[PDB]
Amino acid sequence: EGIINPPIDELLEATDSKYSLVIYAAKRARQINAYYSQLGEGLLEYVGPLVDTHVHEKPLSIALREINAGLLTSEAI
b/e for 10-26, b at 16 or more Cβ within 10 A?
ebeeebeeeeebeebbe
**Are the C-beta atoms of residues 48 and 35 closer than 8 Å to each other?**
yes
Please state the length of the chain.
77
Complex with another protein: residue 42 or 76, whichever CB lies closer: 76
* Contact set with another protein (CB under 8 A): 2-4, 8, 11, 17-31, 33-34, 36-37, 47, 50, 56-61, 63-64, 66, 71-77
**Least distance from another protein to the Cβ atom of residue 14, Å:** 13
**Least distance from another protein to the Cβ atom of residue 49, Å:** 9
